[PDB]
A paper describes a structure:
Gag is the structural precursor protein in HIV-1. The CA and SP1 region multimerizes forming the immature viral lattice, comprised of interconnected hexamers. A single amino acid mutation (T8I) in SP1 stabilizes the six-helix bundle, allowing to discern the entire CA-SP1 helix connecting to the NC domain.
Overall, the refined models of GagΔMAT8I and GagT8I VLPs are very similar, with an RMSD of 0.36 Å. A close inspection revealed that the profile and position of the internal density are different in the GagΔMAT8I and GagT8I VLPs maps (red arrows).
Numbering used by the authors:
A (entry chain L), B (entry chain G), C (entry chain F), D (entry chain H): 143 to 377
């Protein structure tokens, strides 16, 4: 006993990860909470992050790569001593893939003092740093209509990423009412907004379903043509 | 071993509690995740909720009250048998105040099968139901200016509750830009909005700092007076 | 056995208490259902009432006061007889605070016939009578706007007490549609009702948010001023 | 010996706390300076912060609450071994309330290695994080006059918080000369500023002592009335 991370600490960690979508100050809080911990608990803190799976790709990858390098530097020669402190850890197992919590303690407490946990900490910090450089948070605020994009697909992507937005209900609702219409292209906006704000996604879709199409194109063009053409001429 | 709640389950539970600010469907998910658990783990699931401390008042209170009633129904007579299955649980301890995890198991596994955990579950469900009836979620959307309220205090309350809003950074920023100005009273709005949208909280505060005051009152009134007075008369 | 109140009787009792919010005829039905019962069951019938906690203050208080008076009249001298019918009941315990169901029967059946249950009945009846005099039922129908009261607070109190109203869903809905608007002050009513009935609590709030404020005041006054001023004069 | 924090480290810590009124980057510097320390020294670092006592409320509170939870998880069973490593620490004493520096070392150095100091560190970090979310620094810059507020009280609050401002003398003086007058309401500003900048707080107070009062109100209103009334009429 007297080794085990408390659930409120893990909850604070997941709180910091959601509340900040990859800001550089994560490392302080991480090293602070994950203090003197054991590697197994460290994997616990890692896969418990929810969403943002994109970066987990790079994180997990830099982890295995450092593991490989520790392998390349460290030899497996050992023996033939009778079983005791069976071996040296291995880059495969310092991350806790092929080892038990038992072996991790039997490494930490036993002498020499091999701080495998600290080493795992070091690698993961390296990784998080590299992540902080190589990421870009996506928001609901960024989703914008392409210039030539069927409006229906636009809403479908809008909602697709909105469901992942981390907020309460009524927030999302009012978002759906203001930003979705606000962020469209001028072509479909000048028709979605002529139709008053009152009418639901169904009426909106049926209104702008024509954009990009030949009929609507011909009309818009013709209109612009005669808009300036008849300004200073007759017959 | 083979008794202990997994951290991802607790994380899902805190997720459901944040994601929904007291909707009636909490009970299903709660009873589902908290299945056959032990009471100690149940207190773990309870105090780990973050924020929304208002309801914890009523929840904790109905808990102790049911405990009292179980006391009033159940007698403490026992003995003088030698120590074994020392007693019956007590409404004080079924909730795990004066008992250890050890006694909870020594009650659950030992025969007769006293399902203390289930009873604690029953009480807490009762409580959550009563909560669902007696609560009202607060939002950022609701914060509105009183009719006679110094604008500065209005912003101070706005921010005060906003910091508790559960969203990412840029969300909050753009909220601060649209809703804060949008939700003011007509009197200070017709001055905050005459000053163009560009200018920061400092300029806004210095602009509406006069509302409610004698100078501004006299002016507004006078203006309204002569607005209609000079409409159909002269000299 | 052959002592225990049946659950449908208790259900009928809670039915009579909800269905009538403190009418004087409660005593008949109470004495009828609670016939020859035991005190423990009587406390069961008491704290099971739901809501209307206001009166429970006075009820519980008159109970402890009669208990005190029974103490003041009855002496605790007894002994040194060997244990049997250990003592006399006590005003602390006739109400069943420090006694078990066992002692209550060992008092009722044993001779002399001490009708402790009846005495508890007598006190509680006294109490309910005093309550019938000192209460006033609150309804949804009574909630009315103060003369100078921010409309938003008015709705907040409206809903606050409505959630406690004892009716089904659609009842409450249609109530919310008719009474809430119907019961406002003339000042905010003459603006809430100019805006057609169709528009939701949001539009209503934003409409009357100005009442009581300096702008709206100046306007209303000015208007009334010139309404009569220009009736019989010019220039 | 070879355990004791050096005074310049503590001085740097108080420097970082004053110099930054609750920015999120406190945690790095705190964990850095408070490295491997002992809990007693940690309480030393805590109560030595000066001013900003508001947050100490929340900090101290979250500390005792984590202590309670460690209690709820950890049992007090121990014995009957003869005195040696007398017990396990307790959530009451890990924070060093009922323990001596001696017991803290006899816990740290003795085996098993119980890192009580680290655990205290973990809790306090959790706390500081929660503080960073739940605080708002007050400045001298924020103090502003309410819209209807006796000017004299305005200056009294101004000075009241200014004496706590953390700067040298002449800074405060020139502040008192510029900001105090600059931040008043339009009504009293248009009189304080008509009286030239030269005259001291006494003359200023006697000048604006009339604001909000009936005389001054009547005058201001009348003035505004005839300001527009006589603009386009005569007789």
């Amino acid at each position: 006993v007297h080794q085990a991370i408390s659930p409120r600490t893990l909850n604070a960690w997941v709180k910091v990860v959601e509340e900040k979508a990859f800001s550089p100050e994560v490392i302080p809080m991480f090293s602070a909470l994950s203090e003197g911990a054991t590697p197994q608990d460290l994997n616990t803190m890692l896969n418990t992050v929810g969403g943002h799976q994109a970066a987990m790709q790079m994180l997990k990858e830099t982890i295995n790569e450092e593991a490989a390098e520790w392998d390349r530097v460290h030899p497996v020669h050992a023996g033939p001593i009778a079983p005791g402190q069976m071996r040296e850890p291995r880059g495969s197992d310092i991350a806790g893939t092929t080892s038990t919590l038992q072996e991790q303690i039997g490494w930490m407490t036993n002498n020499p003092p091999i701080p495998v946990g600290e080493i795992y900490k070091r690698w993961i910090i390296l990784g998080l740093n590299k992540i902080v450089r190589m990421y870009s948070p996506t928001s609901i605020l960024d989703i914008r209509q392409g210039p030539k994009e069927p409006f229906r697909d636009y809403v479908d992507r809008f909602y697709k990423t909105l469901r992942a937005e981390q907020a309460s209900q009524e927030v999302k609702n009012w978002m759906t009412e203001t930003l979705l219409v606000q962020n469209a292209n001028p072509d479909c906006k000048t028709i979605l907004k002529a139709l008053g704000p009152a009418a639901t996604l169904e009426e909106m879709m049926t209104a702008c379903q024509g954009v990009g199409g030949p009929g609507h194109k011909a009309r818009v063009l013709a209109e612009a043509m005669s808009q300036v053409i008849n300004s200073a001429t007759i017959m």
